[PDB]
Symmetry: C3
Subunit: 80 residues, 3 copies
């Protein structure tokens, strides 16, 4: 009923994003990336992940039945 | 030439948002929500209100000739 | 192969924005506005400038072969 997605989150230069939130859709099922930018989450194969971290644009990525995902976060384009 | 709109502003859990700005369109006619999430503003019946508060997505809501309005603010999806 | 664009950056009231970033597209070719809101940048005539400054919405403006440009920045509509 789920698959286990193992993912890697980087910035545009390919450096790991450490501590990014990775949540299944808008549910309470979520995790954080580790010291290497890696996460593991059990999700529906047809779901989408929301990835966020301070200083970056939040992104929604479709799982598309993939057990391995790479997410490249882009920096925010404003500050206060 | 106006109506008086009495409104209630909440977050997604239904708790009042206290101190939110409620402005007629982009004009200088504005107020703030009280301790109970309530506001009163005199506006054109055909106008729209802009509702904002720190930490939430600004929203525009059509008055649609209504003298009683509920606004549900959603949290921002980034931070810095 | 380039033109020199001389530009003036203001807020909605017409006051200079001092220290705004002015970058050719998403490249490393960039400058900042001076004490009078003015910048000079050498760019492709067919390019676009990205103008940003704390507290304002980032804007992209086409050069359109113009050697003189005015940019009016609008304030951000949220804060944290
Ligand atoms: Ni922000």
């Amino acid at each position: 009923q789920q698959i286990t997605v193992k993912g890697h989150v980087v910035d545009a230069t390919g450096e790991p994003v450490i501590g990014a939130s990775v949540i299944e859709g808008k549910s309470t099922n979520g995790t954080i990336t580790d010291i290497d930018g890696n996460f593991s989450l059990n999700v529906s194969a047809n779901s989408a992940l929301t990835i966020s971290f301070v200083g970056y644009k939040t992104q929604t990525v479709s799982v598309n039945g993939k057990t391995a995902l790479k997410v490249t976060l882009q920096e925010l384009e404003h500050h206060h």
